[PDB]
């Protein structure tokens, strides 16, 4: 495998109102994508910048 | 118009914690992509299958 | 070498819809059919046998 399993988790905005720009790795598209995150909870496939997403999820 | 305006809304897991793998239209990528929906609330850009998303949002 | 989730048991979860799916069974060294109920469960959960085999079989 080329990346940790959490990179394969679908985007989760968490339960807070969606307000913040964040990034997640989309394994189907093989790319890190912007989404709107609530700021609280969610899952490990959640990065502050595209660069950090790309470093972790390759 | 190619699709309803609601197709451009962000993915929204909502405030509940019943994790349903679901699909949303990503207008940037022009693709129906997977996200976690929490089972309540959220918005109209929320489909039970990729096929339903692709028919409704193109 | 393959994802950790390949080693998790099949899990239909508690929801009451029907998504025929495949999971990897390490004892059998093959992917096997199960019904996913639509929510919860785990990542050892594929729409096609071929994807399950690609990801989880040696």
UniProtKB/Swiss-Prot annotation, chains A, B:
Whole-protein coverage range: 25 to 82 of 83
Use in biotech settings: Could be used in a hydrogel with the procoagulant venom protein ecarin (AC Q90495) to greatly reduce bleeding. Was under preclinical trial by the Australian biopharmaceutical company QRxPharma Ltd, its subsidiary Venomics Pty Ltd (VPL) and the University of Queensland (UQ) under the name textilinin-1 (Q8008). Tested as a potent and selective plasmin inhibitor that has application as an antifibrinolytic agent to reduce blood loss associated with complex surgeries. It is being investigated as an alternative treatment to aprotinin (Trasylol).
Give the location in the cell. Answer: Secreted
Gene Ontology MF term list? serine-type endopeptidase inhibitor activity; toxin activity
Which superkingdom heads the taxonomic lineage of this protein's source? Eukaryota
Concerning its family, UniProt says: Belongs to the venom Kunitz-type family.
Q: Which residues form the BPTI/Kunitz inhibitor domain?
A: 7-57
Q: Which cysteines are joined by disulfide bonds?
A: 7-57, 16-40, 32-53
The organism's taxonomic lineage, starting at the top: Eukaryota, Metazoa, Chordata, Craniata, Vertebrata
| Chain positions of site Reactive bond for trypsin | 17-18
Tell me the protein's name.
Answer: Kunitz-type serine protease inhibitor textilinin-1
């Amino acid at each position: 495998k080329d990346r940790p399993d959490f990179c394969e988790l679908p985007a989760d905005t968490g339960p807070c109102r969606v307000r913040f720009p964040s990034f997640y790795y989309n394994p189907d598209e093989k790319k890190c994508l912007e989404f709107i995150y609530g700021g609280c909870e969610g899952n490990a496939n959640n990065f502050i910048t595209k660069e950090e997403c790309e470093s972790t999820c390759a």
